Amino acid sequence: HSHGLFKKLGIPGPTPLPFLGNILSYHKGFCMFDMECHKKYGKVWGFYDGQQPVLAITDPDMIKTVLVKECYSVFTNRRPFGPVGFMKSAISIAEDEEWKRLRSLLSPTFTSGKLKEMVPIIAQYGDVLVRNLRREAETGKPVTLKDVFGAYSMDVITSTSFGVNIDSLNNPQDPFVENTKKLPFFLSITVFPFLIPILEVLNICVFPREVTNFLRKSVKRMKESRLRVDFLQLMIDSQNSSHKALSDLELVAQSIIFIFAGYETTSSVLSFIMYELATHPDVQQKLQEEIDAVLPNKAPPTYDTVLQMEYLDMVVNETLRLFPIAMRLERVCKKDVEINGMFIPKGVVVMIPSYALHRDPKYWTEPEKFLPERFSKKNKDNIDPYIYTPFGSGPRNCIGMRFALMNMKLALIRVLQNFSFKPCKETQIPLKLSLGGLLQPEKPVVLKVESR
Amino acid sequence: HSHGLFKKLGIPGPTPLPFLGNILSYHKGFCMFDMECHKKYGKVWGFYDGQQPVLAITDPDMIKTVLVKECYSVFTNRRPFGPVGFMKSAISIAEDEEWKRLRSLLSPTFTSGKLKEMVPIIAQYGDVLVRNLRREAETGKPVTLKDVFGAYSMDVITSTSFGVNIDSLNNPQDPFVENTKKLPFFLSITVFPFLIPILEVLNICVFPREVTNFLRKSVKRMKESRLRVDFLQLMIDSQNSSHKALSDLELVAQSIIFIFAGYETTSSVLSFIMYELATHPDVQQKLQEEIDAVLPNKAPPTYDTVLQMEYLDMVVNETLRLFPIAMRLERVCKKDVEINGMFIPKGVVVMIPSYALHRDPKYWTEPEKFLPERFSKKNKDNIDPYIYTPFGSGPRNCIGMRFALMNMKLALIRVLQNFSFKPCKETQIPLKLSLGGLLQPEKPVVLKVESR
Amino acid sequence: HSHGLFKKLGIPGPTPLPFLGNILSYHKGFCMFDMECHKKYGKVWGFYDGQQPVLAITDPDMIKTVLVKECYSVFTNRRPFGPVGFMKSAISIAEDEEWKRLRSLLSPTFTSGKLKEMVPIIAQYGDVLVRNLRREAETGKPVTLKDVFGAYSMDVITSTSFGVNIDSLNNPQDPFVENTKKLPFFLSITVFPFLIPILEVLNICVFPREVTNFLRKSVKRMKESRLRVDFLQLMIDSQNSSHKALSDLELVAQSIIFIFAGYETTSSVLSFIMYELATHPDVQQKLQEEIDAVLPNKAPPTYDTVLQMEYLDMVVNETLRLFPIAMRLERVCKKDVEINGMFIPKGVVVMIPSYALHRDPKYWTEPEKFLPERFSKKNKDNIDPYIYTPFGSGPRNCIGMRFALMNMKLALIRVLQNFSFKPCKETQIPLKLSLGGLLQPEKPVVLKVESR
Amino acid sequence: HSHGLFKKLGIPGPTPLPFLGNILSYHKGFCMFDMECHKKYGKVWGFYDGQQPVLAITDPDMIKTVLVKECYSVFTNRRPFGPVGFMKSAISIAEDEEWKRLRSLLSPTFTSGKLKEMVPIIAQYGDVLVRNLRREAETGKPVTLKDVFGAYSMDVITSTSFGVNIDSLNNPQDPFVENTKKLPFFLSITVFPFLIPILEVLNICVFPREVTNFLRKSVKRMKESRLRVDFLQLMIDSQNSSHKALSDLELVAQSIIFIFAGYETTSSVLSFIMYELATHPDVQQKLQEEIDAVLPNKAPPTYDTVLQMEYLDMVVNETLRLFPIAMRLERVCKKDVEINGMFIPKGVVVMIPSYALHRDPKYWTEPEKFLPERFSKKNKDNIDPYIYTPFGSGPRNCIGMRFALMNMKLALIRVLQNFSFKPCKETQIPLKLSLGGLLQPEKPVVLKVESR
Ligand code: HEM
Ligand code: HEM
Ligand code: HEM
Ligand code: HEM
Ligand SMILES: CC[C@]1(C)C[C@@H](OC(=O)CSc2n[nH]c(N)n2)[C@]2(C)[C@H](C)CC[C@]3(CCC(=O)[C@H]32)[C@@H](C)[C@@H]1O
Ligand SMILES: CC[C@]1(C)C[C@@H](OC(=O)CSc2n[nH]c(N)n2)[C@]2(C)[C@H](C)CC[C@]3(CCC(=O)[C@H]32)[C@@H](C)[C@@H]1O
Predict the structure, then answer these.
(1) Which residue from A268, A429, B19, D278 puts its CA 20 to 30 A from D308's CA?
(2) Which of B264, B262, B265, B238 is nearest to B250 (CA)?
(3) Closest Cα to atom 40 of ligand 4
(4) What residues does B54 pair with on adjacent strands?
């Protein structure tokens, strides 16, 4: 039915099949579908996730209007997601005023002030990171990074999102690790969205119950044992209250949505970085020299000395341009609206193809090359903040951005203070993106790790 | 799941069964369930249509807040209804700004000015009403009113909602009558609301297609033949334009929702009136004398002489108190709100039990008796407009109220100018309400019709 | 998922899309899809109605095995159909032993003995047929046949399937006609077969209730008024009893399934015949001369004189080859089986493309031409009864075949005894088949009717 | 709808609620619902799982007819179960001829001949059982049996169902243990059975994919490494072939269904036994003396010496009467049939309430007491094999019964050769059954373990 919408508005796009819409075209991945539509149709285009019209926009004014100017009034929420259960109280999933409240209640937790108090927690698990790596480096065996890096990203989440301290790699049998390790079906979510409500009254939760049952009680253990500078405690202090306080269940739901947002992003960006540092050894040396300058004698990184490292920042940012691991941003259009000369009707999903804008030859020279100088203070100013959006933009951007950048930077400083990384015969050169759902390598990153 | 809500808020009500909620209790009808809960639980109570929490309110302040003060801000829409298809553009079904627009676009059509121009159309089909009745009165055979009255209510709808002129009783084979006569499943709508969206992508429309296909083309015939003072023409003139104009499809959807709202209401109220006039012959005589006074020599009623008839008005109103044929009013609570001292959480349905307030001994003496003096100018002032609500109240009340009152009044004046109505041995005394869905008699009204 | 089946077996066919299978290819109609697959892939091919594998077979041995030899053992039922409700007791819909019983209980009703007793009923409504036609022939106005023919097919069904006698064209307001005239959504039945069971527990019946409620009571009126040689009475006599008797509800369900099978088939074949007789006037004259020979002085047809008419038989049969209005036959494969050298796995639907075999140049010379001599006693023997199957074949073939042939033949004899039929400027020459579901003309048949 | 069935047949039972049927009555558990209906309604009764009629039968003749005489003809399959995916090829889930084949293909694997070859595998993991227990016995800490016993039941399954050898308690990090440890929602399966097919086309498998993906490949590793006397190898030898061979996928599906059937049954019976041996210390001593007699000097048990132990057999059997952990047996009635004087219509589920027959005072004196002498050779003969059915009866009974009895007996001999078991203050005396789904203790069994 609703497949006639874009034709009437005169918006171009690929013709949709009945029921499926355009979803068959996701067979080369979201990344390649988006690049092709940018190429074929120019500045705007429309496709259909099943019956759901999606309008893609690439003009930086329009993007600003949607992400900033008309965020509260028109473009407040992302695509409706389910079946969720009580996770409807997670900030990323909540809508309209419930989100606005949740955002207000959680924002003091992610300030640079609070982030400086967490850096000694984040630091200690970098030590754990190196001593897991040195065990594989002294054994002359090429390293699968996602395992040592995956363990780091999960380690930092426990101790910051619940206060629990695990060497998940070597304390694998902690009751905590096993439950938090319970991190395809979502294509049917789309040809058959009418089925989400079925599952909701069936208590078929996308977040399994035993885990959510554990953390609820496990936080209700810690809440009633203190009664530490982790997200848990910063949230327990906020509900010691303007809007209402954060109910016990809501504080759990936020913790869980942090784990999810933080775990595989941090792991994948870190792997993407080390792949680039190994295939661009010059960039690696220059970074190691900066780390040794700011931190002589392999001094431990601190909040302030991290923010001192400009090339490290340049490497991280250039990597997040190549691999914006969320790939897209979305907002549901909640009202009939006109923006920067374009009528947009109610219920359309508006989408910003980050990946494709990050690799748009119209804004970047040699967009496939890993050139960190792009982000040099001399050249950084000629970058558009609505073209480069690895963490989104506007009131609903990534609230954990500052933390995620410190966290990865702390990982890298220490791992580069100790090791060098070289391609193995088993390294996938060139790295190929997973034609599948999330932004991750086809083949995992394997490299030789030697000890300075 | 959501069956714990009212307990937490400390709102009383009948305990719900899983999945079903309280729906098993509708076995004696909505009317008796509501009276019992008013009796058992006082001024507010909560029940569950399956999983859907419904909060009943009976304080006239609170009712005013919900229906008037916080209508636009909080309580704007009725229970979500489907699967509807294109009838999503009908004003009664549209929500929020789309409704606000539609209401603005249609309101000039229902003014007392426009109503006076339609009274000669409505009048001519009263003539048809009498000559169908005189045929059954000259044949010494007790009359089933819903047939002669049903034919009247449908007759007035055609000529006012599309311009077509049919003696539906004696021109039964008109292509128009057969399609418009395509006026249980809605209990499953409620234990299984998750199934509405299934039907929507299945084009399973609650309003069958051929009819809606006919009127679309049939209005697109009349629109392109004129290019008359019916609702159709008053709507064709409005789209000759503040909001946007009323799209061709939208004008059809309004016409259809008028037929629906107008047909069985007008038929049932008229039957309820004649049942009361026959079991209260004094009231009938006194009305016939008023009709003969204002209209000597059986003069034809006009707009102004109808508004002159105060007892006729008193009869109609007293009847609509006994039989408020919509029974309830509803608004979905769109925000967490507090009203007249009571927190009401988002997504609750708020409900005003009209029938039960209309028969609440706390506001009416002998509420079961048919006493039209209740509405005497002497006594009319001591009536609360939020207790007596046969047409609702506030910005979303019955937009066709003035028309519906003229229409029934025009029916009655003429039918009483000519006939008297007496109970037959087959009359159901006392009339019993249909324990089933809509407000209508168990047994249809049969009476003896004699000719003055 | 199940889209890999035919590849493994090495059966050719069009590649299916996910979820949809091959259904997009029905856009030129079942008839053209089948002819193309016969052309492209030879003697067997496979396609998918959504996830449902369908195997097409065209070898007359194989067809015999499926329709006859292994009917009871393997290929007993047609595609599961719903949501049906109590019509699960109709013989066409019942499965396995319940069907075998029903077939036994109903078979004496369709004998040539019983058919001769019904011919005077069928005859009288042919008279009604002519006098509806003569009214349009004396008015110099081209005739839409499906209206006069549709009225005939429905007339004969009432009086034979319930005993009721209506000139439906001129007694349109009979309570009986209106309910029996309550004779697209079935494509979703197939991409979403998982939804039939939903509707079943929702009492969403494909046969609406009021009709089925009427006939149940209306037969329970006639059953309790007699307690006539119609199907109703022949069924009331059978339940006056080997298997069990035919429950009251079952007798209704059979009556309804007869109406359905008999109404639009008889109407459409009759229209196809008259279209061919008008575009082949030679064939019409030769038939009129045979009718006048056997029946001199426009003598009324009888059972025996109908069976005397060999060219009339030749015309009817040749027409049913051109337009086999069921188009296909189907059986679900209930066991893993091998037949005439071919493994066929459980749950596959096996399909005989009648239309396409009826127009297969490999068995018919000039298959598009209307050549009734094909069925001449000289040439009739060289016809394969598993290639020509307008009524199916084997234990589950059309049980009402003998009746349907008499019925149409009786229509034609009388209408040709009185009128000649000539193409009008508004006749669609050449007739185009409806690219839509059932086998019927794109445009309805309009012709000039003159009076001998 | 179908809630009228038992009334018509004159079968008594609890009146069902719409949609839910009788399921609300499962709130005290299946065990108590069944005992109450046996008490209230006598020898047969009917209830409804939602719309699904279930007929309970308790006459031992009738039970024999259903389980034996008419197994192949009428009562072949259990309740249809889903959504399953490829596990449709598991023998317990397969139906009719596909089951009959699978049963034939797997039956040589469960002979007493093959069982004697596996006893040295089963034995070695009893050693592992004791040395896990001795660690908790030397630490003066009451033992949670389900952990040490759960680890035993899973240990024996790996090495016999795939050949893999793990001390799951102390090798917890084996890639094999973690995947095999991926062993509520099924009440909705029943009010909404119409939803199983939805999930099937959604690939929503009740057996998660990664596990089933692992074992498929992991067996395809072992199959292609040998190419040992485990079930895997005995099945690899069978497909080296009457029916067809066991496809690669089918052999996996059987292995998985063995794990499921074998894991929690063996763990729970073993816990039930040790609870009874600790609350009946006399029975424990008498068993320990028999074990020491047959096996002097704590000799290791063998196949033959296990079958020598008559009291050990008496203890096990008496326990399985108290706690028949499947609780019920079921067969779908596939045909209208009459059995031992009782019409049973097609599609009814027929159910044998094992638990309730095992505790029926009409067949057992003091049925709540743990009296192993019931099974003494003197008294064993007066036991009805259709009243006592811990493993079912007839062609579809528990195919792994002989193995399950050896397995538990081997556990017990060794654990009693070494330890004595005494109630702790934390022991739940009397043990209460879990009012929830499967037959297991409310509270897990904790006891003091001392070392002989
Ligand atoms: C390198 C790591 C990460 C990347 C690349 C990333 C990316 C993103 C993006 C692109 C968005 C959507 C922005 C928008 O819609 O405009 C987002 C949202 C969000 N992220 Fe991050 N993210 C990362 C790590 C984290 C971490 C560590 C947290 C820890 C708390 C976090 C918490 C959130 C939340 C709560 C939201 C939704 C905010 C809202 O809905 O108001 N993310 N992330
Ligand atoms: C005696 C006859 C009638 C009665 C007792 C009646 C009663 C009602 C009631 C109780 C409501 C809801 C009010 C609320 O929610 O506050 C309503 C709404 C409505 N009625 Fe009437 N009605 C009658 C006839 C008519 C007629 C003749 C029309 C012709 C146009 C009509 C058009 C509508 C519409 C469009 C609405 C919804 C308005 C909106 O959603 O904004 N009704 N009616
Ligand atoms: C010219 C008119 C008709 C045509 C072309 C036609 C065609 C067919 C065909 C092709 C089948 C399926 C045969 C098979 O699957 O092998 C069938 C089945 C059937 N027909 Fe006819 N039909 C006609 C009229 C009628 C009439 C008048 C009746 C009146 C009783 C009737 C009753 C049935 C029944 C009950 C079945 C299913 C039999 C069973 O399932 O055992 N049909 N028809
Ligand atoms: C003490 C342990 C066990 C108990 C109490 C138990 C009980 C049962 C029962 C009551 C049945 C249904 C019988 C019927 O419907 O008549 C059954 C079926 C079955 N069991 Fe066991 N079981 C146990 C262990 C095992 C084990 C260790 C296996 C290992 C292979 C196994 C394999 C099966 C299979 C395949 C079926 C279904 C047979 C078929 O459908 O043909 N079970 N079990
Ligand atoms: C769970 C949170 C949501 C709904 C999906 C996310 O998180 C994941 O994708 C986790 S993927 C995984 N599952 N299991 C394992 N090991 N990894 C995304 C994609 C990502 C973190 C970036 C943030 C954001 C919003 C914009 C997005 O695009 C998503 C969050 C906040 C979303 O609200
Ligand atoms: C209702 C009966 C069924 C299920 C469909 C039929 O009947 C129709 O198609 C009626 S179509 C219609 N609907 N409304 C109006 N006015 N016409 C078919 C197609 C046809 C009669 C030939 C017989 C058979 C079996 C083989 C078929 O192919 C069908 C019957 C017996 C089927 O069991």
Answers:
(1) D278
(2) B238
(3) D92
(4) B47, B349
Among C1, C19, C200, the residue with its CB nearest the CB of D194 is: C200
> Are D336 and C97 within 8 A, CB to CB?
yes
Mark out the alpha helices in B227-247 (DSSP H runs).
231-238
Q: How far is CA C213 from CA C178, C182, C429, in A?
A: 14, 12, 43
How many Cα atoms within 13 Å fall on the side-chain side of residue B286? Answer: 13
Distance from chain centroid for Cα A246: 24
Who's near D381: CB < 8 A, 6+ residues apart?
none
Task: Specify whether the CB–CB gap between B222 and B162 falls below 8 A.
Answer: yes
> What token pair was written down for B155?
């007759």
Which run of H or of E encompasses A56? strand A52-57
Q: How was this structure determined?
A: X-ray
- Cβ A203–B335 below 8 Å, yes or no? no
Ligand 2, atom 6, residue with closest C-alpha: B391
Q: What residues does ligand 1 touch, defined as CB less than 6 Å away?
A: A 91-92, 103, 257-258, 261-262, 265-266, 269, 325-326, 329, 390-393, 396-400, 403-404
- Residue type present at position B423: P
Which distant-in-sequence residues (6+ apart) come within 8 Å of D444 by Cβ? D144, D145, D146, D271
Contacts of D162 (CB under 8 A, 6+ apart): D176, D215, D218, D219, D222, D230, D232, D255
Query: Is ligand 6 within 6 A of the CB of residue C41?
Result: no
Strands A349-352 and A52-57: parallel
| Residue of B448, B421, B441 lying closest to B274 (CA atoms) | B421
Token pair listed for C347:
């749950």
Q: What strands, in cross-sheet order, belong to the sheet with A419-423?
A: A143-144, A446-451, A419-423
Residues D67-82: b if buried by 16+ CB within 10 A, e if exposed = bbebbeebbbbbeebb
Q: Output the CA torsion sign for A82, A83, A86, A87.
A: negative
Give A186 to chain D, closest Cα distance, Å. 10
- Shortest-distance Cα residue to atom 43 of ligand 1: A398
B26 burial class (0-12, 13-18, 19+ CB within 10 angstroms)? middle
Domains and CATH numbers, chain B: 1-452 (1.10.630.10)
User: Do A325 and A408 meet the contact criterion of CB atoms below 8 Å apart?
Assistant: no
Contacts of A327 (CB under 8 A, 6+ apart): A30, A31, A34, A353, A354, A355, A438, A439
Q: How far is D190 from chain A (nearest CA, A)?
A: 11
Q: How far apart are CA D166 and CA D72, in angstroms?
A: 40
Dmax over Cα atoms in chain A, in whole Å? Answer: 67
The 3-class SS string of C101-161 reads HHHHHHHHHHCHHHHHHHHHHHHHHHHHHHHHHHHHHCCCCCEEHHHHHHHHHHHHHHHHH
Nearest Cβ partner for A185 among D173, D185, D204: D204
Q: Compare CB distances from D202 to A173, A188, A202 and report the shortest one's residue.
A: A188
Q: What is the D419 CA–ligand 6 centroid distance (Å)?
A: 75
Q: Which two tokens stand for residue C106?
A: 């109903």
For strands D419-423 and D446-451, give the pairing.
antiparallel
Spell out which residues of chain A touch residue B195, defining contact as CB-CB under 8 Å.
198
What CA–CA distance (Å, rounded) separates D22 from D15? Answer: 7
Beta bridge pairs of residue A451: A419
Residue C266 CB–ligand 3 contact under 6 Å: yes
Measure CB to CB from residue B203 to each of A1, A194, A201 and give the nearest one: A1
Tell whether residue D37 is among the known ligand binding residues: no
Ligand 3 atom nearest to C326, measured from its CA:
10
Cβ-defined contact of D198 to C194 (cutoff 8 Å): yes
CA B352/CA A437 separation, integer angstroms: 49
Which ligand 3 atom minimizes the distance to the CA of C389?
10
